[PDB]
Curated annotation (Swiss-Prot):
The lineage of its organism: Viruses, Riboviria, Orthornavirae, Pisuviricota, Pisoniviricetes. Residues 1-56 form the Ubiquitin-like domain. May form homohexamers. Interacts with N protein. It comes from Severe acute respiratory syndrome coronavirus 2. A zinc finger (C4-type) spans 188-219. Residues 70-298 form the Peptidase C16 domain. The chain holds residues 1565 to 1872 of 4405 of the full protein. Zn(2+) 4 binds at residues 188, 191. This is Papain-like protease nsp3. Changing residue 3 to I: In strain: Kappa/B.1.617.1.
Length: 298
């Protein structure tokens, strides 16, 4: 009986040595099995596979606990959707553009590149170790796994049309924002003190206008107190002037002929427009902006 030793895992942190019979498929021995995202369930082991790490579905209590501790989801479909995405995202190119990890365009991923760029410019503490780990890898240039996880957590497949604001929101719902706060106070003549407080993720997002200045001035009429490391402001795509130094980064969205495309604008020493692998510098920017992000900087 020919055999090799492989490692199985659900988290790539805890590795479980296995002895595999080379005359049977991985599926026969492990159930659904993946090698770097590729479905090798129906494949017989190769000698090149010796010593390699394979992902498996959490079929026992031990693996189920390891998966829950790493991903913080009980969805039994997660790992398979994660692997399905990783098989694609591993083949994407991740150029460094103006000091940030971006993604060369493929598979309708402009929204993911724009989200990835934004995530590198705001302070976020992810709760699932899987996201915290891959976040720090992506920030160092190895972003394939992070992108595959974003797709899995957002319940989106490679190639599906995506929205930066949505993606950011759903990632925020996997972060520790417990200390973020927005207090709204009613401006009235005869209604007394009327106040409501948004804590957590609701505090870091707003829909209706792009301008933080207008929002802080007031929004029937409300005085606002904002306490968060960042805020995401979104509005319908509209021609909008981005002035250097007045924002951290922004999403541009065009919908010519109903085929959308995102670009990312970041404010450094001047305005940089990152469009996947492409980089364009300018002193002024006017375009159809739909998200603007602002950083508190303590
Ligand atoms: C009242 O607050 C808002 C805030 C944002 C708004 C945005 C849109 C958009 O069109 C998105 C632009 C960005 C791109 N997505 C598309 C991406 C794929 C699916 C839709 C579409 C429309 C209305 C909005 C209203």
């Amino acid at each position: 009986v020919r055999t090799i030793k492989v490692f199985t895992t659900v988290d790539n942190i805890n590795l479980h040595t296995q002895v595999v019979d080379m005359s049977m498929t991985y599926g026969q021995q492990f159930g659904p099995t993946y090698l770097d995202g590729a479905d090798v369930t129906k494949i017989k082991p190769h000698n090149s596979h010796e010593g390699k790490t394979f992902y498996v579905l959490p079929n026992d209590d031990t693996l189920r606990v390891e998966a829950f501790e790493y991903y913080h989801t009980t969805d039994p479909s997660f790992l398979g959707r994660y692997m399905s995405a990783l098989n694609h995202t591993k083949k994407w190119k991740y150029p460094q553009v103006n000091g940030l990890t971006s993604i060369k365009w493929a598979d309708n991923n402009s929204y993911l590149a724009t989200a990835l760029l934004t995530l590198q410019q705001i302070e976020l503490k992810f709760n699932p170790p899987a996201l915290q780990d891959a976040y720090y890898r992506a920030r160092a240039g190895e972003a394939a796994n992070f992108c595959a996880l974003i797709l899995a957590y957002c319940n989106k497949t490679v190639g599906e049309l995506g929205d930066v604001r949505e993606t950011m929101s759903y990632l925020f719902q996997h972060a520790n924002l417990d200390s973020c706060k927005r207090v709204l106070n009613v401006v009235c003549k005869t209604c007394g003190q009327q106040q409501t407080t948004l804590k957590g993720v609701e505090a870091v997002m707003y829909m209706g206008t792009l301008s933080y200045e207008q929002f802080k001035k007031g929004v029937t009429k409300y005085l606002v107190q904002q306490e968060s490391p960042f805020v995401m402001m979104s509005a319908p795509p509209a021609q909008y002037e981005l002035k250097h130094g007045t924002f951290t980064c922004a999403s541009e969205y065009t919908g010519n002929y109903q085929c959308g495309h995102y670009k990312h604008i970041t404010s450094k020493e001047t305005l940089y427009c990152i469009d996947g692998a492409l980089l364009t510098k300018s002193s002024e920017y006017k375009g159809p902006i739909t998200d603007v992000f602002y950083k508190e900087n303590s």
